Amino acid sequence: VGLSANQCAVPAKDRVDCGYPHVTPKECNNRGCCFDSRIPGVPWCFKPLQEAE
Ligand SMILES: CC(=O)N[C@H]1[C@@H](O[C@@H]2[C@H](O)[C@@H](O)[C@H](O)O[C@@H]2CO)O[C@H](CO)[C@@H](O)[C@@H]1O
């Protein structure tokens, strides 16, 4: 698995959108991003935490 659980534990308020409305989980995965639909009204597809570039 590429992204770890800890990389995707991003508080809702800090999430940076990596997708767009109605983006699918697979599209999100294919961008190297985190998917979470549990919390409404915040990005469901968001950038992971990782070491900086
Ligand atoms: C209000 C908000 O931040 N919306 C996000 C979020 O949208 C989800 C989903 O993709 C939509 O189809 C649905 O209608 O609303 C969801 C949120 O409740 O996530 C997407 C993807 O990250 C963002 O582009 C939206 O801006």
Numbering used by the authors: 4 to 56
Paper excerpt:
The three human TFFs (TFF1, TFF2, and TFF3)1 are ubiquitous in mucosal environments. The trefoil domain is comprised of three loops (foils) formed by three disulfide bonds. TFF1 and TFF3 are disulfide-linked homo-dimers with each monomer possessing a single trefoil domain, while TFF2 is a single-chain protein with two trefoil domains. Using a combination of ELISA, isothermal titration calorimetry (ITC) and tryptophan quenching assays, we demonstrate that the cognate ligand for all TFFs is the GlcNAc-α-1,4-Gal disaccharide.
